[PDB]
Structures are given as C-alpha cells and as structure tokens.
Amino acid sequence: TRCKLKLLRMERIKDHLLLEEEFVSNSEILKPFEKKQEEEKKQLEEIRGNPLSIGTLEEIIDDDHAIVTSPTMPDYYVSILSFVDKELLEPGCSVLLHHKTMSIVGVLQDDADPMVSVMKMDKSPTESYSDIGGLESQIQEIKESVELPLTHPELYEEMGIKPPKGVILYGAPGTGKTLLAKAVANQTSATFLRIVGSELIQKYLGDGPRLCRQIFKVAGENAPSIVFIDEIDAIGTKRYDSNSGGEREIQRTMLELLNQLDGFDDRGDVKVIMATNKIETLDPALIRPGRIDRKILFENPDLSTKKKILGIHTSKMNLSEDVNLETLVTTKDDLSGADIQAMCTEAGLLALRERRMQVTAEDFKQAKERVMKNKVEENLEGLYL
C-alpha cells in the first residue's frame, strides 16, 4: 500500500502545481498586449480560412516563396507564413494552402503512406531462440552480429572496431534459415522491415531501381533497422517473364541494390539479413567483404542435435507413456529439421481424424513413414556409394 503511496505523493504535488502554473501564465502573456494568447488562436483560423486546398510542393524557392502544384493544374508563387518551417518542407511534402490568396499556412499532417506500411511489419512472432533445436554456437555468432551492437555499442568502441555489417544465412533447405531470422527479429525490438526478394522483380521495366531505393529510404528513417531479404536467390534463378526489360533489367536492379546496401549514402544503422539457398548463384560484388562482414553456414543436424529438434516440437503435444521418442530419431537418418516439425504435425493430424487427443507411438511411426516417402533425397550423393 505504501509503495503506491510514495509515488502518489511525488506525482500529485509536482504535476498539479505545474497545471496551476500554466493557468496563471496564459493570463500574464495577455497583459502587455491586452489578449495575446487567446488571440493567436483566433488569428490562426482567420489566416488559414476554410477550405484549405492541398497541393504538393513542387520546388522551394529560397526567399520564403515556393511553387506548389495544386493537382487541379495552375501552379502558384505562394508565400510562406506562420505555423510551418522551411526544413519541415522538403520537395514532395504536402502543403496546406489559404484559399483566397494562396499561401503555405502549414502542414500539421501525418503524411503517412500505405507504401511504407508494406515495408513494415505488425508483429509478435512465435519464433524465439531456443525453438532452435541445437547448433548453439551458430546462434552465438548471429547474435554477436545482429542483436549485440544494439545492447552494447560500448564493446565495439572500447575495442575500437566498427560493428560488423551484414550476415548471409546459407546452407541447404530445412536448416532453419528463416527460423533464426525470426527468433532474432523477436528479441532485438528494432524496426524489422521485411522484404521477399522476388517482389524486387516487377511487371514493368525500370521500376526496379525505383522500388529498391524506396526500401532503404524507409529503413534509413526508422534507425536502427534490420532489412531482411528472404531468398535473394529467386531473382537469379527464376525469370518470371512479366518484366518487359528482360534479362537486362534484372541485372540493372542488382546494381542499385549494391549502392543502397553500402555505397556513398552514410545512412543509419542498417543490419541486413540475407537468406539464400545457394551463395554460388549470387553476384560476387553483391556478397563481397566489408559490406557482408560475417557469413554463417548451417549444414544438416547430427544424431544428438535431432534430439533437440524433437523435444521442442513434441512438447506442445499431448502424449502417451507408449511414445518412445528416441526410436523416431534412430530410424530417421539424414533428414532435415524441417522433416521432424512436419512429422509431429502429421502424427497429430492422423490423431485428429481418429477423434482423440492422444498421440500414440503408432501415429508417430505412421507419420514417420509418410514424411520419409515424400522426400526424394539428393542426386548430389549418387556419385558416392
């Protein structure tokens, strides 16, 4: 009770006293004039009138005048009045115009776009570290790269190193490249912009360099930022034939992507996470040192590491004392971590058709058979015995 009481006692006197102080000060402001404060309010309305016509600021002329483009078509050499600043106006900004004689009377507007919201996420992933079934060291090379300079910049200035930029998460399918990216995306709580690499080829030609440069503009504002580029492999392997600029066009999108990634900009902190399935397909300039400092590799889980993948996934499940978890690992060899997650789901699904909550050893073996048939393995290993 008294813990609430000391806060009550500080907060009441300081705040209510301040409230009283404002009330007296509006009045005192009034005196050298005869009513200054309550008249500034009547003036603002008067100056601006109604309506206010929106324009788009076309170019700003340095003399407290501007050329605004009403979308109705006449352009105007307007004056810049009160309740605005000229470094709050940038070319492109929307302006609020006095109807009778055009003047820039302000812009209190939000000026938000749905174009930016596409870049952004709304989020609370299900993905957290330690849903990673093993490979612990690899977590503490990624976390040393992405998450750690936000927690402490102190280590990196004390050492005198520049904090590492860029990670490439590569290996085989099912090694949880997307699963790491989201586990660290939850923890950091820095604005996590997500963009899938395939959206970077469009149906127009030349829109490429334009789209790419818009990503990094959003990313730059909301500093610090992560830009996650999921499967930047897709653009090199698949040409969709929707782009009229062809093979040429896709190559040009690459080149703007190089400057926006490092370049001459001297933008904010932008870590970049790049998932890909093959790193021998991506353009070598794209991946080159000092713009991608650290390159982590994942390879297939071990006999023990598969045990970890299984505990984390069988834990949600209702179970029997007939379930021998251990014999599902020994039977299954050279299968992904993706296969173990699909195997729990497939057992539960057979169990939902039988109309019971239990998951038996038999629904697990039944499920284990069916997921192993569907994988059609590698011809990479058909050389070898």
């Binding site: 206010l52 929106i54 324009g55 009403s70």
Partner: protein
Amino acid sequence: NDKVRFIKDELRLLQEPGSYVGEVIKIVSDKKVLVKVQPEGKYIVDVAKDI
C-alpha cells in the same frame, strides 16, 4: 397548408449554393476532415454542427 407554404418558399431554396460529394480519407484532430472531391483535389475542412 404544408402544400402551399412549401411551394412558395421553395423557390428561395432553389437559389442553391450547390454541393459536392467527397469521401473521408482520414480525420485530423483540429476537427477537420480530409476529403477528396472526385475530379478535384482534396480539401482540409471543418464540420458543421449537423455532424
């Protein structure tokens, strides 16, 4: 009485200033609404006492 009173002053009501139809894009907290009238630019403008 409603019929004859109505036709007679209806003539002054047909000295209309006009109307327009827009649509609410978003509000603002100065009690003003951003409307886009259909073949025209947007207007930041105040509500009457009718809404």
